[PDB]
Design a protein around this ligand. Structure first.
Ligand SMILES: *C/C=C(C)/C=C/C=C(C)/C=C/C1=C(C)CCCC1(C)C
Ligand SMILES: CCCCCCCC/C=C\CCCCCCCC(=O)O
Ligand SMILES: CCCCCCCC/C=C\CCCCCCCC(=O)O
Ligand SMILES: CCCCCCCC/C=C\CCCCCCCC(=O)O
Ligand SMILES: CCCCCCCC/C=C\CCCCCCCC(=O)O
Ligand SMILES: CCCCCCCC/C=C\CCCCCCCC(=O)O
Ligand SMILES: CCCCCCCC/C=C\CCCCCCCC(=O)O
Ligand SMILES: CCCCCCCC/C=C\CCCCCCCC(=O)O
Ligand SMILES: [Cl-]
Ligand SMILES: [Cl-]
Length: 264
C-alpha cells in the first residue's frame, strides 16, 4: 500500500537511505546522553521537561532503528538492484510512534511556559486530542498513497485542520505566557515557536511526496525530509527547551543551574 514497495532501488539509493536512518539513530542516542547529564542542573519544577527529551530521544531512536532493520530485511541485491523480498517496509509505524512522541514534545513546552495545575492539565488535554486527530487522520490518509491519491489528499486536508488548530493553541499559549518567563527566555521561547512551525511542516510535505514525485527518488526525498524534520523537531527543539529550563532555573535561584552556566 506504500510507494516504497513499488520500486527497485539502486545500490546508491538503498545505501543512502540506510545511512540516513542509521545516522538518525546515532544522533538521537548521542543527544540522549547529553540530556541525561544536564538534567541535574535543572530545577525540580522544570526537570521533567528535560526528562521528556530523554524519553523522546529513545522513542525516536527506536523507531529509526526499527525502520533501518526493516529496510535491510525487506530488500536484497538481486540482478543489479535492491529488490523487495518477503518482509515489508512501511512508514506507517512512524505514525503510531507520533501518538506518543508528539504529546511529549508538547508537554515539555507547556512546562517551561510555567503552566501549572488546572491550566496545564486542560491545555495538555486539548493539545493531545488535537495532535491525535491529526495523526490518526494522516495515518488513514497514507493508506491510500498508492491506491487513491484523491483520498490521500482529502484525509490530509482534515489532518491539516487539526494541525492548524493545534498550532493556534500552541502559539496562543506561547505569546500569552511569554511574559512569565525568566532569564531572558521570553525572547528564546519565540524562536522555539518558529522552529516548531518550520520543522513540523516538513512532515505534511513528506506526506504529499507520493502525489508530486511517485518514484524511487521521491522515496529517497521523503526519508531525507523525515531526517531533517526529526533532528529539528526533537533534537534541536529539545536542546532549546533544556536551555530555557536551565536558564529559568538559574534565574529562580537554583544553585546547580547557576554553577552550570558559570562554567560556560
Ligand atoms: C517528532 C515527530 C513529529 C514532530 C511529527 C509531526 C507530524 C506532523 C506535524 C504531521 C502532520 C500531518 C499533516 C499536518 C498532514 C498530513 C498528515 C500528517 C500526519 C503527516
Ligand atoms: C556530506 C556528504 C553526504 C553523503 C552523500 C551520500 C550520497 C551518496 O554517496 O550517494
Ligand atoms: C538539521 C539538518 C540535518 C540534515 C541531515 C541530513 C544530512 C545528509 C543530507 C543529504 C546530503 C545529500 C546527499 C546526496 C544524495 C544523493 C542521491 C542518491 O544517491 O540517492
Ligand atoms: C553509554 C552511556 C553511559 C551513560 C551513563 C552516564 C551516567 C550519568 C550519571 C548521572 O549524572 O547521574
Ligand atoms: C476511519 C475513521 C477515522 C476516524 C478519525 C477519528 C478522528 C480522531 C479525533 C481525535 C481523537
Ligand atoms: C473526524 C473527521 C473524520 C473524517 C471527515 C471526513 C472527510 C475525510 C474522510 C474521507 C472519506 C473518503 O475519502 O472515503
Ligand atoms: C525546502 C525545504 C525546507 C522547507 C521549509 C518551508 C516549510 C516550513 C514553512 C513554515
Ligand atoms: C546552521 C545552523 C544549524 C543550527 C544548529 C542548532 C544547534 C543547537 C541549538 C542550541 C540551542 C541553544 C539556544 C540558544 C542559546 C541562546 O539563546 O543564547
Ligand atoms: Cl523548583
Ligand atoms: Cl517519533
Amino acid at each position: 500500500k506504500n510507494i516504497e514497495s513499488l520500486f527497485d532501488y539502486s545500490a546508491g539509493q538503498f545505501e543512502f537511505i540506510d545511512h540516513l536512518l542509521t545516522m538518525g539513530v546515532g544522533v538521537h542516542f548521542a543527544a540522549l546522553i547529553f540530556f541525561l547529564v544536564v538534567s541535574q542542573f535543572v530545577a525540580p519544577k522544570y526537570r521533567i521537561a528535560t526528562a521528556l527529551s530523554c524519553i523522546v530521544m529513545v522513542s525516536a531512536g527506536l523507531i529509526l532503528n526499527s525502520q533501518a532493520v526493516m529496510w535491510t530485511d525487506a530488500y536484497a541485491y538481486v540482478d543489479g538492484s535492491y529488490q523487495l523480498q518477503d518482509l515489508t517496509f512501511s512508514n506507517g509505524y512512524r505514525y503510531v510512534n507520533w501518538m506518543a512522541t508528539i504529546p511529549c514534545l508538547l508537554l515539555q513546552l507547556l512546562i517551561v511556559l510555567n503552566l501549572k495545575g488546572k491550566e496545564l492539565f486542560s491545555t495538555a488535554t486539548w493539545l493531545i486530542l488535537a495532535a491525535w486527530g491529526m495523526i490518526i487522520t494522516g495515518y488513514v490518509g497514507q493508506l491510500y498513497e498508492v491506491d487513491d491519491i484523491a483520498q490521500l489528499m482529502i484525509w490530509g486536508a482534515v489532518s491539516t485542520a487539526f494541525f492548524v488548530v493545534m498550532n493556534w493553541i500552541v502559539g496562543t499559549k506561547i505569546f500569552k505566557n511569554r511574559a512569565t518567563m525568566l532569564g531572558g527566555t521570553d525572547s528564546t521561547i519565540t524562536k522555539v515557536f518558529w522552529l516548531m512551525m518550520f520543522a513540523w511542516t516538513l512532515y505534511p510535505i513528506a506526506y504529499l511526496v507520493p502525489a508530486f514525485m511517485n518514484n524511487a527518488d521521491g522515496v529517497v526525498l521523503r526519508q531525507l525530509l523525515f531526517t531533517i524534520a526529526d533532528i529539528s523537531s526533537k533534537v534541536i527543539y529539545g536542546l532549546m527547551i533544556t536551555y530555557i529550563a536551565i536558564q529559568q532555573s538559574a534565574a529562580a535561584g537554583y544553585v546547580p543551574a547557576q554553577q552550570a552556566l558559570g562554567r560556560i
